[PDB]
Amino acid sequence: SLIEDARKEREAAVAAAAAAVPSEPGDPLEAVAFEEKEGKAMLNLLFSPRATKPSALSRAVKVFETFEAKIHHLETRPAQRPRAGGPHLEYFVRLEVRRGDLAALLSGVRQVSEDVRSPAGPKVPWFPRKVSELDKCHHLVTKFDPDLDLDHPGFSDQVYRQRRKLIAEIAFQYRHGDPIPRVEYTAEEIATWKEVYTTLKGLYATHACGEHLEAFALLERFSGYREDNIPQLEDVSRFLKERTGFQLRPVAGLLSARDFLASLAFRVFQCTQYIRHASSPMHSPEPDCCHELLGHVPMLADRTFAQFSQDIGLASLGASDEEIEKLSTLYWFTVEFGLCKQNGEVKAYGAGLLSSYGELLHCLSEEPEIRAFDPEAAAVQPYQDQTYQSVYFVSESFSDAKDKLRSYASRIQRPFSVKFDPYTLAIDVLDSPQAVRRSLEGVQDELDTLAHALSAIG
Amino acid sequence: SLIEDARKEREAAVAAAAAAVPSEPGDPLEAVAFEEKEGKAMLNLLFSPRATKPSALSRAVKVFETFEAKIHHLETRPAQRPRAGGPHLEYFVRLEVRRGDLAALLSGVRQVSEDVRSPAGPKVPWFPRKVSELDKCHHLVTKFDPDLDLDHPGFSDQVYRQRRKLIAEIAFQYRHGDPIPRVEYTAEEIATWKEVYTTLKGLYATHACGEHLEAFALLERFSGYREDNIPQLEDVSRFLKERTGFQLRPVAGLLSARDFLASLAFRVFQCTQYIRHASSPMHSPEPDCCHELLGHVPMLADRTFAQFSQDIGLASLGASDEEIEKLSTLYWFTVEFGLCKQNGEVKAYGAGLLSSYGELLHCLSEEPEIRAFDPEAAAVQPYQDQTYQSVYFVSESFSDAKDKLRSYASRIQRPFSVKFDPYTLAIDVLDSPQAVRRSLEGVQDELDTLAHALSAIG
Amino acid sequence: SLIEDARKEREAAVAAAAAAVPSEPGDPLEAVAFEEKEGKAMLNLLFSPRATKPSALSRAVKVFETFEAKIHHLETRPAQRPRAGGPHLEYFVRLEVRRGDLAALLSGVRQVSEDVRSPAGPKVPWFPRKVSELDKCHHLVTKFDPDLDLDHPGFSDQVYRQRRKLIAEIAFQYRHGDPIPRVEYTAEEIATWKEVYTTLKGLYATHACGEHLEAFALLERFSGYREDNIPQLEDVSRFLKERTGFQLRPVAGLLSARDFLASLAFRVFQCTQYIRHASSPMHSPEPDCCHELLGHVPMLADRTFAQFSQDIGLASLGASDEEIEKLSTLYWFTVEFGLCKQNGEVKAYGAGLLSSYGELLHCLSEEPEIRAFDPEAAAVQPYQDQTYQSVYFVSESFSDAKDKLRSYASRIQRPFSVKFDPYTLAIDVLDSPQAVRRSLEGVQDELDTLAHALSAIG
Amino acid sequence: SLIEDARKEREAAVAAAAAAVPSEPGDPLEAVAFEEKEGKAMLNLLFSPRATKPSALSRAVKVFETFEAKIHHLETRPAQRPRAGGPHLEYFVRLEVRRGDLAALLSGVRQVSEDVRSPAGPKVPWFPRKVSELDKCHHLVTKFDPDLDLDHPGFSDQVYRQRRKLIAEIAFQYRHGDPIPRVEYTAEEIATWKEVYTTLKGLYATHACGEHLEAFALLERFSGYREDNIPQLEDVSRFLKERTGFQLRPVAGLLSARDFLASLAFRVFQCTQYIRHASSPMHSPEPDCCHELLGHVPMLADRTFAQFSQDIGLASLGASDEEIEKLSTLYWFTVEFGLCKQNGEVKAYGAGLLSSYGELLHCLSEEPEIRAFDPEAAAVQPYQDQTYQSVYFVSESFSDAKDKLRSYASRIQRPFSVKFDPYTLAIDVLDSPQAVRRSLEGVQDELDTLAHALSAIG
Ligand SMILES: NCCc1ccc(O)c(O)c1
Ligand SMILES: NCCc1ccc(O)c(O)c1
Ligand SMILES: NCCc1ccc(O)c(O)c1
Ligand SMILES: NCCc1ccc(O)c(O)c1
Ligand SMILES: [Fe+3]
Ligand SMILES: [Fe+3]
Ligand SMILES: [Fe+3]
Ligand SMILES: [Fe+3]
């Protein structure tokens, strides 16, 4: 339903854009996007006048100086000179005018251009830079939003509502760096956990990826994945951070696509503490604690898989809503439902595959269609809800998927790039060569250390 | 007094070696170092027989097979062939014999060699690999050890003893990953903190490094470095981790040199919660909470300085006690007492310099001797205790010190090398090329990401 | 016929091995391979005695010291300890004994082992290190060897024999660094060249790779590829060196597979000055000057293709005869007959494809089988002679072929590796980490230069 | 006298600039630098009008469109916004106008600005990109220029003039890629060569760098550096190319500073075939064949020294005349006269040091001043002519000099950067990130090859 989530997010965004028009029409000056800085407003205007004699842009620049505005950058470059037949007439302005004088001279600039817009298109969808703001803003932007899910199967029990309230309070009031508040579990949830644990463990020897099996074995040895005791979150978070360098974060409510992908970028995984309804233990209408504990968490213990997911998250940064949907679809057809070709046979590592017993049976059956993984194909192919998936993609080696994702991100246009810093666990934008040099200096230092090591050995 | 600490550690180690002889002399088989594995014992013997005709090593290897021992690696190579005049006769054995049969055939091997030893010298001083064991073992190895310091100035007040008990309980019972337990502060300690804060802040505008000043300003803005409220440890730890990727760890008792250097390697700094005695606010007999908060913590906020310290810690890994002393001396003459040449004039960034008002006055005065920093010279030059330092080293740029330390580590012999992983914050030994290739793969992946970024920009 | 050449070379080598046995049998000491150094002989012996009690290797090492031999390295390590079920009993010796005393004590060592051999297997097939020896030794090893080719079509004309004599004299007496001696061309050869040039150029607009077309256009513009004048070798060599960093070398006679691959490694291509027989202008029984000028030379102007060929040559270094055959087959199915998928359609870049008009027609026809390129598949699939090829491999991008060859070389076992130095155009073996560090230093210097450039730009 | 050469070159250049004014003054449109392309002229104009109300730049841009000109890039950005107090008012234009209409509308643009210039300053001093043009253009630019040197000591003999004619004909008519035309030597020159060879070899055991000594030994072993036979140029060129990857080029006449530095960049060294005058064998008024054969050639055989010289040459590319003088001075105080600190004592490797017996005696004497090498200090300190040098710089390790030169080039501003390609021995400008990525791809490929090698070893 995450593709549904991405579609809902993008349609909500476009509706907001569809509602971003002034209530009162009739003003041709309503499309001039501007922002105000230090009492004045900095903005931009583009003109596309045809032919060559009508070059009255002087009047427009006679407008700009009419109020002693602060010009950041004026430029003019008639089109069809660098490329012919694809661009159109344009000339770039960026200027700061007194907010009162801004409209006054924009009235005069209306005497120069009528049928064009500002040259600056979509600037960027905002994204965090460090883990701290990732928690702080995305809890503030996700405040006061309870989940109803009444029409969903079950969820009519008041005790379920109280448990949801408790989980929401724990997650929403949780800050970064803090330890996971331990949550109790009565007999019903632990019994359901025991049932699902037994049913899934008895079949995990089959159809499952060997990495998943070994990760599960190590976790049940250390973290305590047993039918009797449902594991908490702090212990598994510590284990993952220690070995795979990964950690979790409790969350509830309607998570967007963007925040989830940002979390994925920061090598942190959002999670929910409560589990599915006891009336429906075989499947859950919404992914729950057991879903991640058995579908996401185990295969997430792989260093290469974690790196691949992190690369996905990195590519997700600052991407437009369409690209967000594409990345969500790729996640669905790779992480939630992913197939591997190892030891000759095909095994399953998908989270959704590793979270539903019926889907576990169906995935390796011959009824559903299976094909080799393709980034673009997985990014276009649609999904289904409340029904078994019939189309699957297989990746024999996670390295192959990683490099394919590298290529996909490379061909994905962005006005910048993104680098991750595990030292401070931060994100440094890549829009000027100076940051590239800064990163390369550390790269060279690591290379020198490696050379010293190589000299030492032998 | 850390050079004194390193000297005490090495003399204790050699005394243990001086006490590692059997109580009963007269057995020429007491020097055969051996360890027992799986019911049998794996060990090694070397022989240096002169001339060339006495080559009765066959008898020794007639000894080895006399009990069907498990031979790991037998080798023989007469000396003076590769290098002449510096080595001596040797031949390497490594074998596993039944622990009962081991001594029985060693009796026969005594018929072959008498005046030689085992070929395996010092294997390695054990060191941790991840942060978890760094806490767990080094708290278990440092258990049940209270500090007396009665002869030290003050410390006769029972309330001071109770405060020391509280700090020791907090630190010794603190585990990795846990948040810092907040510790209260009565009027006396906060008043002393206010006094020292005022006295040091009023002079930090002078004689101090600009990095220290800006770090202090940022901390007092965010962490709350003010005379009224003494800052805690969790907040500053969070700040350092967020910006400089550094964290602290409470500790008490007699810290060795080795564990401190290992902590330094893991980008974690050991610290004490209590402060100096109110009777002696001008100086402390032992470094305290204010010492690190004002001497270590501020300058530690520098990315380059933190990296330099981390490189020091990395070089410290597995080093023999003599090298431990050398590294301690370098730390004393660089971190505790370090001078920088910036903006034309000379400023101070040393922790001890930035922790004593009298030493702050004395350091930039013309009475003490000042010279340019040299790694070897700082590693040989001695110290003094309870008195102002007269010899100082200056480093105009922390990068220069960093590369000099790189060179010093390069010329420092080790049977391996060390690499740091900030993703999982772990340590991977460097003794086989395969680990080098593993690291280089990630290096190449980062290079590919940088190339993609460079393609994107422009 | 190059696969035939590789097969002939390997069967000749094994026949020499089959003839490397002493004429007089009956001596169990005839299999002890040894070499003599400075009046003594350095060699090695292996023993595989079963069980554990028969450990009379002492007697063998009682043999070694019986003549005061010079022992380089004695080792002993019973098998089934590191790996069980695949190895067998062994222990390594390497020793130098007086050449007269060598056989005398080998007689005694025969009292210890009878059914085993020396531990050192195939050391290496010798290969050059620089361009100079590549010319000097491989002309000395290929001296006094005329080509007969009488049974081949044509070649009964005495004038053809005289032309072959002239070409052989020019090539065989040509030294490295010298300019190409210009060779005249009478009316017959230039007329045949005009005919083949017209026929191939009229069709090169079709079925041919765009890189080939542009390279041919540039060459005919500069080098002078025209039907009227047959181009010489010095001009095209200068052009290739200037642009693609490649050069040619005249050669005749029966070229082995090894020397050709070594030349390929050194970014130099062996060539013949004479052309095919006028009686058979449509096809040649043996590749000639026009074959390379139109099949090899043009596509060789590609930087990426030249790099790919150079990587092939690099992988060829020191490879055993079987691997030589594999590399030859890969060259045949990639260089001589290679298909590319560009601009949607499939084009041909194979040298043999680009050298035969009939094969040019046949290659893009639907009768022959066409498949995607696979390194292993192309290395196993056989060939045919004097008949059109029915099986072809296609590579959409030369980079894909390059990385596949990288992988193939990686999985190809060698006791060392090879690096190329275009500064001195030499080859440095890679068998010790020190050379790796030496190379990495230059790599880091280039990285620093790139960082300086990046800082400068912008 | 090379500093004199650089000074003469720069004063000639500025005199040409001082003579680049129109013969007829009085036209305020004579300073508008313009170039004509495809029948029209592309150029640029800058205006610095004070205050803010006089913003009549519209009129100037009303001028530009008055003839339907082709505008490449118009920009406007008032100063004091990004940086205050150091820049002045400016706005950038670059436009192409009909060459007849260009002056016509420039007349109107004179009504807008009078006291300013074009915004494009010095574009670049032209430099070659490959070895071929380096020879072709710099022989065409240096055509018909005989050397007089009559006032110089000796050189009154007609036979000397004839020898100079022969050398000039050989060098000036020599093309790249061609072998060195061998030049005969009568009894007088070979006798002088024998004398200087004996005198310099008898002292080269002293005061000389060990690298020079070993290089000389290897050359006299192979190339044939003996008093009886004066060595030619082709043999030594082959030797240097084979080992150090360096080659020579005959040249005569008044060589500029720029062409010499470009040659140095291309790892090629200009040289003269004739030698000094027999009347003055102890010293030469101008450097000759023996000077380079004994001063430049031997120490040039060092890989590190050759790399350092190549880095100097690389930095020299496109540098302005002042920077050319700086580089020349650095060459004089490093290559011509350089001191090294090895084995404890100080030795000499300077070319001029290694070319004059009297200067050889004087250099290691205590009369001249000796100091540690500094790039800036050597780039500012002046010289003397026909007299012994009194000031010398010493570099203990050529790597130190190399990295200091790296830093000096880094701080040297250029609108681009330079990279060398030994594969095709070419120069690729570094002004766009795409070329950086192209280079980095090959760097990564070499890294992958190194990783494969490292995997193979062990
Ligand atoms: N993004 C939609 C919610 C979600 C998150 C993580 C999962 O593993 C999953 O199956 C579903
Ligand atoms: N190592 C001795 C104790 C110590 C630790 C850190 C310091 O900064 C300091 O001044 C003293
Ligand atoms: N190696 C066999 C001879 C040969 C060499 C080069 C070729 O391009 C070719 O077609 C044939
Ligand atoms: N550049 C001035 C001429 C010159 C060139 C090379 C030298 O080594 C030298 O001493 C003098
Ligand atoms: Fe899931
Ligand atoms: Fe301190
Ligand atoms: Fe061919
Ligand atoms: Fe010189």
Residue numbers in the entry:
A (entry chain B), B (entry chain C), C (entry chain D), D (entry chain A): 40 to 497
Sentences reproduced from the published study:
Tyrosine hydroxylase (TH) catalyzes the rate-limiting step in the biosynthesis of dopamine (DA) and other catecholamines, and its dysfunction leads to DA deficiency and parkinsonisms. Mammalian AAAHs mainly present as homotetramers with a three-domain subunit structure: an N-terminal regulatory domain (RD) that consists of a structured ACT (aspartate kinase-chorismate mutase-TyrA) domain preceded by a less structured N-terminal tail of varying length; a central catalytic domain (CD) that contains the active site iron and binding-sites for substrate and cofactor; and a C-terminal oligomerization domain (OD) responsible for dimerization and/or tetramerization. Inhibition by catecholamines and reactivation by S40 phosphorylation are key regulatory mechanisms of TH activity and conformational stability. We used Cryo-EM to determine the structures of full-length human TH without and with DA, and the structure of S40 phosphorylated TH, complemented with biophysical and biochemical characterizations and molecular dynamics simulations.
We were only able to rigid-body fit a good-quality homology model (82% identity) into the lower resolution RD density. This explains the lower quality of the RD fitting in comparison with the atomic resolution modeling of the CD. For this reason, we built a model in which the side chains were omitted from the RD structure. In our structural model of TH(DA), S40 was placed on the N-terminal side of the α-helix, at the base of the active site. Finally, two of the apo-TH-specific peptides reflected an interaction between the N-terminus of the protein and K204, a residue found in an external α-helix that surrounds the active centre. The larger number of crosslinks involving the N-terminus in apo-TH compared with TH(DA) speaks of a higher flexibility of the former, which is consistent with the presence of an immobile α-helix in the latter that would limit the movement of the entire N-terminal tail, indicative of increased protein stability. As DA-mediated TH stabilization largely determines the steady-state levels of TH and DA in vivo, the full-length TH(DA) structure obtained in this work improves our understanding of the structure-based pathogenic mechanism in THD.
